[PDB]
């Protein structure tokens, strides 16, 4: 009935809509293969702050939710679906950490190693606790895959090359089982808003994160980064082709969780253009970046215009 | 009751018996490690034409089947087993495309790129349609594995090295799930003609096709091509050892679908001899090629002598 | 009722407690990264003989068991759990073969190839027979994984580099399915002595054996050996963290089968220190070796003091 009680966790995904984008506009300002466009770095300055403000506000309201109604938090945690959203704040904070604007650090040779330890203490603690709790047959909504690759990226950025290999191995081990189990029962059309958002978006995006983590850790675009990227591209093509355009769709706030895969799948190709200099690669990167940015912007406008003039966004007594 | 109605799709496999062989006799005429044998290229000329004629005749009779009795085609398509034979004509045509005799093209530096696009338009269309139809728990008789590796070979031959990597990645992704699911319930003895031919032959042959596609695309026999080939060899050894010779077997026209794996597993070793010059490798390649050719020839003679003098080959009202 | 009838097969695991250790004390006497410690080779001399004596005695009593009560052997073999112990003698003998003290062979450039063939005749025969018997849905207690990597190590030591690749490929193929199937139902706490010892120890140790076999066969610590080792380390960390220390545990003779994984996971890190010269790697190797040796010694003392003064070690009429 009150505002605090009627608050879904999916609001974390809203941050995932923006923070990942904050990465891409940095790459377009520093990509050696995209110097034809005069993309000023100032475009990155007015996105990182917005993402940080959104994260701060959402974390604030969630903490105010926990301090008052603990029974709601306990009920939400003990769910077969909503567990995957408990890794969201760490991932969003890590994506914000990677994309610091150049103005803050004139010489960012290496970031201080405190942030990585601070952000992987609780992450491994929560992951181990969740896995142990669930272990005591569909092990697809209780294992984390995306966080390991982002952590490998962060560790490589900090300066611990050796550490990031462990995270990459753990992420690969956790991803193989999920890919084996889930692919046989992949959701069909007219099921995107059918209470599966925390699961099927971070399964077509993790293949792309590996293509970035491996390239960052090794520095050479070998065959390892040229296969996971193509697997992600094939999945993207399958989703684009199989969807039913004739049936159509209706607006939902839950669509914000499906913008992360296509947003993180364009930095992969913009970092792939650097390896193979050619017209098709640059055209593909540009068109994917354009469509991702346009969809993000139109979704933001729609959710802004559907929240203030009308007060029907928040469901009551879920 | 009539000839047109009583016509199984497995006739496509007959082409798979010959066209793949047309590849091998080309390799034996150009293998640098098999120049001791004075294998004239003329042996390849009188096999490619035969395979093309067989394909033309079988395609003709199948088209005449479709134009008259559409209900039979609809019933055959909506089956849990017979779907896998709907990828056969494209694979056979592609194998015929790879093994063009040298006489036709005096300087075959690169084939024209039209053929690959013409042959992968419908192939991807059909694969996507079939997967989407089945998705809407044994996902082993509705996914294609062999076609991707042959397409990678064809794309590498044409001149698009970059394209063939995508097909290789897709084939690997589709093969891993099939290998995981099927290996736990591998068919036992006295079950080869038990209505499973479209499935278990293209599971012990796809591991060998990768060893050829990777070598062709990269040009160096690295460790990637030295593991899938050994997996295929181990599967071959298991089939040879476990089969019950005491029980015996009876002649069946359906045996023509099991000659493709051993035929395509000998070009792998004849292209593996080129990497490691040694007596055991050459002996293994020669003996596998000999046994495959002998079995193909004896099967052809048996099916020819069991078709004209006696009119009991075609079952009535399946 | 009699001694011969009341004899479990798990006694083979006792040899696995010692023979693997005989390897480690050899490495500490020859590791270029552990020359600070003045570890004399004499420590290896008084362990290999002990392991050989234990193996001889246990094999003797098991043969005397088979010659008298064949029905007991038949009943033990036809069990859903006890099959995995039928590969133990070959593995222990192979581990004894690898760790021959230097004094016996002044110039051990290459071992004679007879031993490998003698030890892989029966091994492949038994593996194929067991797989064929079981095939005619939890395929986790009838497939062998560890033996292939040890065989690859032995073949590389003998001088047949090419042969050991086949064993590595077979081991990888058999391990992938086991890892996929078993990881979803990994045993929880208070279940280590719950009649699962032949299964869950050789699943957290096989990942480490690959890191040694690949390094031995190729001679360069590439990325292949730096991922399976980390997977094994992650599994080790998960076991250490998740176990319930508050509940405690009671002594059991069956604990001897769980000392093999941590014993074979320390030679991996002592051979990993040679690739990356650094303080953390050496400290990790030293502490793992110390804890493994201490646990082995305390378990041996406990099982010696629980066998002679008290006669309650052997259960009657299992
Ligand atoms: C969707 C993603 C996140 C899951 C991971 C899929 C893997 C099964 C793929 C991705 C990268 C692929 C590997 C990429 C790099 C190599 C090394 C590669 O080396 C070469 O490229 C040949 C010679 C050279 O250039 O070094 C040989 C194949 C192999 C092992 C590939 C095998 C299959 C791998 C491991
Ligand atoms: C039956 C087939 C079709 C399925 C594919 C099985 C894969 C799981 C195998 C086949 C090739 C193997 C890879 C082959 C090549 C490499 C790179 C390889 O590089 C080396 O050979 C070491 C140093 C060098 O020579 O480069 C390290 C292991 C690895 C990744 C192997 C890991 C396991 C792979 C991917
Ligand atoms: C727990 C174990 C026993 C199961 C095996 C897990 C595999 C899926 C892992 C282990 C080694 C990994 C491979 C290790 C070596 C390579 C080649 C590697 O080459 C590089 O390291 C980049 C450039 C170079 O240094 O050669 C690229 C990734 C890849 C294929 C890795 C992909 C994933 C592999 C095959
Ligand atoms: Cl970036
Ligand atoms: Cl996740
Ligand atoms: Cl060829
Ligand atoms: Cl297929
Ligand atoms: Cl050793
Ligand atoms: Cl085992």
Numbering used by the authors:
A (entry chain C), B (entry chain B), C (entry chain A): 182 to 317, 327 to 508
Task: Quote the study's own text.
Slow anion channel associated 1 (SLAC1) is a slow (S)-type anion channel that generates anion (Cl- and nitrate) efflux on the guard cell plasma membrane and acts as a key effector of stomatal closure. Trimeric SLAC1 harbors N-terminal and C-terminal intracellular domains (ICDs) with the transmembrane domain (TMD) positioned in the middle. Multiple serine/threonine phosphorylation in the N-terminal and C-terminal intracellular domains activates SLAC120,21,27,28. To reveal the activation mechanism of SLAC1 unequivocally, here we report cryo-EM structures of AtSLAC1 with different phosphomimetic states: wild-type (WT) in an open state, 6D (T62D/S65D/S107D/S124D/S146D/S152D)29 in both open and closed states, and 8D (S59D/T62D/S65D/S86D/S107D/S124D/S146D/S152D) in a closed state.
HEK293T cells expressing AtSLAC1 WT evoked robust ionic currents compared to the mock-transfected cells. Since we prepared AtSLAC1 from an insect cell expression system, AtSLAC1 were likely to be phosphorylated by endogenous kinases of insect cell origin as similarly reported. Highly conductive AtSLAC1 WT showed predominantly the open conformation, whereas less conductive AtSLAC1 7D and 8D exhibited mostly the closed conformation. We also determined the open state of AtSLAC1 WT and the closed state of AtSLAC1 8D with C3 symmetry, at resolution of 3.8 Å and 2.7 Å, respectively. Both closed and open states are nearly identical to those of 6D. Cα atoms root mean square deviation (Cα r.m.s.d.) between the open states was 0.58 Å, and that of closed states was 0.42 Å. To exclude artificial features from enforced C3 symmetry, we also conducted refinement without symmetry in both AtSLAC1 WT and 6D open state. Despite no applied symmetry, all protomers of WT and 6D open state are almost identical except ICL2 and ICD that have asymmetrical distribution as expected from weak density with C3 symmetry. Nevertheless, ICL2s are extended from the center of trimer, and connected to ICD regardless of applied symmetry. The density of SExt is weak and dispersed, reflecting long distance, weak electrostatic interactions between a chloride ion and K347 and K461: 5.6 Å/4.0 Å in the 6D closed; 4.4 Å/5.1 Å in the 8D closed; 4.3 Å/4.7 Å in the 6D open; 5.8 Å/5.8 Å in the WT open.
